[PDB]
Amino acid sequence: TIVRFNRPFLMIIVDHFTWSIFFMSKVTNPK
Amino acid sequence: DRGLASANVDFAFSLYKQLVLKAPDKNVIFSPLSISTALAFLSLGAHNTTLTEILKGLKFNLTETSEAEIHQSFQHLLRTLNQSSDELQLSMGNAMFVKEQLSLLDRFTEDAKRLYGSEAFATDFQDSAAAKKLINDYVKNGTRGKITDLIKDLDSQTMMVLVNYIFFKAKFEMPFDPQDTHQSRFYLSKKKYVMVPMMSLHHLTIPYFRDEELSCTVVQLNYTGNASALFILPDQDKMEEVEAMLSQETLARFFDSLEFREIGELYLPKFSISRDYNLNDILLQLGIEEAFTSKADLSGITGARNLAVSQVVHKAVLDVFEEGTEASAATALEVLFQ
Ligand SMILES: C[C@H]1c2cccc(O)c2C(=O)C2=C(O)[C@]3(O)C(=O)C(C(N)=O)=C(O)[C@@H](N(C)C)[C@@H]3[C@@H](O)[C@@H]21
Known part of the structure; x- marks a missing residue:
C-alpha cells in the first residue's frame, strides 16, 4: 500500500489525554 | 471533561468551515483551542445575553454545564497543556493588557489569574507603538519566536486586549x-x-x-x-x-x-505555512453579536457596561519537517x- 500526499490534504493535531484539537490545517499548496 | 471536549471539537469544525469560506482554495492553519480559550476568558467578564451568546457560540450547552463548570474545565485543560519532555513541548498562556487607570473588579482579576493564568499588564494604548510592542513581545516570548506581529494596527483608544497563545513542538x-x-x-x-x-x-x-x-x-x-x-x-x-x-x-x-x-x-511534503485572520465576520455569523455592539455587557470586567469588542485577530503557523512538527x-x- 502506498500513501502519497501529492495533492491537497488536511492535517489535524490532536491530544488524546484531553481530546483536544490543537491545530487544524488544509494544505492546498506547500510551496 | 467530555462536555468541554465535545464543545471545543464542534467549534473547531464550525470555525474551519467559515475560514474556508473566506477563500476556499487557500491554505488554512489555525488553532481552534486558542480561539475557544480566548473567548471563554472574555466570557468571564460578560453578563446576560452577551454571555449566553459567547458560550452558545462556543458550542456549549448551558443546560448540561454551568458557566462555573466551563471555566473550571478551561482551568484544568490549561494546566495540562503546559508540559515538557524530550519528545513534546507545549505551552499555552493568557494575558490582559489594560489601560492603567481603568478600574477593574477584583473578582475579575482574581478569577482571570486563578482560572486562566492571566496577569494584567498596564498598557498606555495612546502610545500605540509601545502598546503593540508589549503585546507582540508577550506573544513572541510565549511562541518562542514563531509569532511576532500578531497586532498590526491598534486603536489608540483601546481599553483592553485579551491574548491567548499556544506553542507546540514535537518529535x-x-x-x-x-x-x-x-x-x-x-x-x-x-x-x-x-x-x-x-x-x-x-x-x-x-x-x-x-x-x-x-x-x-x-x-x-x-x-x-x-x-x-x-x-x-x-x-x-x-x-x-x-x-x-x-x-x-x-x-x-x-x-x-x-x-x-x-x-x-x-x-x-516538507512545508511551512502561515495564515492570519480577522474573525469578526465569523464570530457574528456564529451568533456572537452583542459583544460587538453598544448592547455589549462586559460589566463583569469593570462594574459598568462600558466595554465592547472591536476586533478579534488570529495568527497561526505550521512547520512540518523530517524530525517532527512545530505549530x-x-x-x-x-x-x-x-
Ligand atoms: C484523541 C481522540 C480525539 C481527539 C480530538 C477529536 C476527536 O474527535 C477525537 C476522537 O474522536 C478520538 C476517538 O474517537 C478514538 O477513536 C477513541 O474513541 C479512543 C478512546 N475512546 O480512547 C481512542 O483511544 C482512539 N482510538 C483507539 C483510535 C481515538 C482517540 O485517539 C481520538
Whole structure:
C-alpha cells in the first residue's frame, strides 16, 4: 500500500489525554 | 471533561468551515483551542445575553454545564497543556493588557489569574507603538519566536486586549530520514503542479483507514502516546466533498475506523505555512453579536457596561519537517470603551 500526499490534504493535531484539537490545517499548496 | 471536549471539537469544525469560506482554495492553519480559550476568558467578564451568546457560540450547552463548570474545565485543560519532555513541548498562556487607570473588579482579576493564568499588564494604548510592542513581545516570548506581529494596527483608544497563545513542538515517533527527501510533484489541481521537497518513509506500520464512501484515505502519525497528527488525503478532486462531511461525528468515525496496516511507502511534503485572520465576520455569523455592539455587557470586567469588542485577530503557523512538527498560534480580542 502506498500513501502519497501529492495533492491537497488536511492535517489535524490532536491530544488524546484531553481530546483536544490543537491545530487544524488544509494544505492546498506547500510551496 | 467530555462536555468541554465535545464543545471545543464542534467549534473547531464550525470555525474551519467559515475560514474556508473566506477563500476556499487557500491554505488554512489555525488553532481552534486558542480561539475557544480566548473567548471563554472574555466570557468571564460578560453578563446576560452577551454571555449566553459567547458560550452558545462556543458550542456549549448551558443546560448540561454551568458557566462555573466551563471555566473550571478551561482551568484544568490549561494546566495540562503546559508540559515538557524530550519528545513534546507545549505551552499555552493568557494575558490582559489594560489601560492603567481603568478600574477593574477584583473578582475579575482574581478569577482571570486563578482560572486562566492571566496577569494584567498596564498598557498606555495612546502610545500605540509601545502598546503593540508589549503585546507582540508577550506573544513572541510565549511562541518562542514563531509569532511576532500578531497586532498590526491598534486603536489608540483601546481599553483592553485579551491574548491567548499556544506553542507546540514535537518529535515524530517514526521520523523521516532526510536522505529520503527528494523534489517531487505536488498537484495543486489535476493540471497544475509544482515541485516540492517530498519526505518519505518505507515499510512502516501505522493506523490507516480507507473511507470509500467519502473517497479519502486517513493515516495517523504519532508524536507521543497522547499527541498525534491525523492526516486526511482526499482522492483527486474530492477535497471539497470531504470538507462537506467534516464534523465531530465524522472525525470520531475516522479515529474509530483506524487499524494498523503495513505501508510500503508514505510520501509527505516538507512545508511551512502561515495564515492570519480577522474573525469578526465569523464570530457574528456564529451568533456572537452583542459583544460587538453598544448592547455589549462586559460589566463583569469593570462594574459598568462600558466595554465592547472591536476586533478579534488570529495568527497561526505550521512547520512540518523530517524530525517532527512545530505549530504556534495566538488570538487577540481588542476592546474599546463605550
Ligand atoms: C484523541 C481522540 C480525539 C481527539 C480530538 C477529536 C476527536 O474527535 C477525537 C476522537 O474522536 C478520538 C476517538 O474517537 C478514538 O477513536 C477513541 O474513541 C479512543 C478512546 N475512546 O480512547 C481512542 O483511544 C482512539 N482510538 C483507539 C483510535 C481515538 C482517540 O485517539 C481520538
